[PDB]
Amino acid sequence: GKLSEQLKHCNGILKELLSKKHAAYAWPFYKPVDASALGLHDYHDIIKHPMDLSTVKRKMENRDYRDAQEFAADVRLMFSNCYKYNPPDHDVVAMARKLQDVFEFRYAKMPD
Numbered sequence: 328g329k330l331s332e333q334l335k336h337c338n339g340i341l342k343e344l345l346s347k348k349h350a351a352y353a354w355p356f357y358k359p360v361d362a363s364a365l366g367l368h369d370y371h372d373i374i375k376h377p378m379d380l381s382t383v384k385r386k387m388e389n390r391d392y393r394d395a396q397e398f399a400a401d402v403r404l405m406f407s408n409c410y411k412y413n414p415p416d417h418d419v420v421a422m423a424r425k426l427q428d429v430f431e432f433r434y435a436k437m438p439d
């Protein structure tokens with residue numbers, strides 16, 4: 328079906344974002360930000376809705392996403408959190424930009 332086919336494309340994108348091909352810049356986004364471990368004691372005051380690729384993967388596996396739009400909103404929320412918390416000249420923001428380019432260009436190839 329339409330939703331199934333579009334969610335197959337989303338699952339393909341998710342696998343690519345987690346693949347060794349993109350590991351050099353994807354690694355900050357693999358797991359939830361551990362604010363306490365990183366000494367970022369303001370992270371949860373600034374970021375109300377944390378998101379990361381392991382959470383997107385669990386939601387995809389649990390059939391939480393009913394359509395491609397819901398999946399894309401979570402992937403974009405993950406990048407937006409990075410752009411909100413970190414100064415724009417920081418290394419992690421450059422890595423976010425690169426992984427979001429991978430995401431946006433392949434998401435744009437969504438089947439109709």
Ligand SMILES: C[C@H]1C(=O)N(C)C=C(c2cnn(C)c2)c2cc([C@@H](O)CO)ccc21
Nearest residue numbers: 354355356360365367408409412413418419
């Ligand atoms: C605030 C935080 C963030 O937005 N993200 C997405 C996650 C990390 C992070 C750190 N450890 N892990 C396992 C992930 C991260 C990494 C760096 C630098 O170390 C990048 O070089 C800087 C800032 C962050």
